[PDB]
Amino acid sequence: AMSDLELRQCLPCGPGGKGRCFGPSICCGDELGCFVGTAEALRCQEENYLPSPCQSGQKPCGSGGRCAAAGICCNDESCVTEPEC
Amino acid sequence: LRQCLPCGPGGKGRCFGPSICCGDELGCFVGTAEALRCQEENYLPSPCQSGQKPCGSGGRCAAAGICCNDESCVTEPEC
């Protein structure tokens, strides 16, 4: 909307759609963990069809990532262990 | 250096780090229930290193398209 402060999360994914897509093949969720290239993350490929900017997660960390699950920090092509998260 | 503990669905994963469990089969689990066994490698006196084809920051190809070390996985396509 006004700013990127109002940016939407990406498609949901994983078990019960309890995760959110952090990249085309990362599906994370605070109660879920992160799936990197697994089947649960497959749905995240669908986001590249949407004509609209998304960004999952709230708290920045690592190299342009946001705290994707407990202890993990994901951008759209990596997930590092990161205690900040 | 022996490969690290097996982990994940039907033993077809290797532990790459205390919370990472990858299989060329399954992909990678980072901090999921699948990757919980990888903790247990802290209890074994022998050093390990799963995977074999080297990539990125001191890591090995973990799954199709994925390079992991003991604390990170990165979409990395030489793998």
We report the CATH number of the domain holding residue A58 as 2.60.9.10
Helix (H) or strand (E) holding A34: strand A33-36
Tell me how many degrees the CA angle A2-A61-B71 measures, rounded to the nearest 5.
145
Give the Å distances, CA to CA, from B27 to A23, B9, B38.
15, 11, 15
Domain assignment of residue A50, given as a range: 1-85
Burial class of B10 by CB neighbour count within 10 A (0 to 12, 13 to 18, 19+): exposed
B76/chain A closest Cα distance in angstroms: 8
Count up the domains in chain B and report the number: 1
Q: How far is Cα A27 from Cα A48, in angstroms, rounded to an integer?
A: 14
Distance CA B62, CA A16 (A): 27
B64: left (phi over 0), alpha (psi -120 to 50) or beta: beta
Question: Could you say which DSSP state residue A54 is in?
Answer: B
Residue in the structure block whose two tokens are 């697994």: A38
Amino acid at B6: P
Are B49 and B66 in contact, with CB atoms under 8 Å apart? Answer: no
Nearest residue on chain B to A71, judged by CA atoms?
B31
Resolution for this PDB entry, in angstroms: 2.8
**Order of strands across the sheet with A26-29?**
A12-13, A19-23, A26-29, A33-36, B27-30, B20-23, B13-17, B6-7
Q: By what technique were these coordinates determined? A: X-ray
Question: Is A34 near chain B, with CB under 8 Å?
Answer: yes
Cross-chain Cβ contact A80/B72 below 8 Å: yes
Provide, as residue numbers in chain A, all residues whose Cβ is less than 8 Å from the Cβ of B34: 33
Please measure the distance between the N-terminal and C-terminal CA atoms of chain A and give it in whole angstroms: 27
The whole-angstrom separation of Cα B52 and Cα B79 is 10
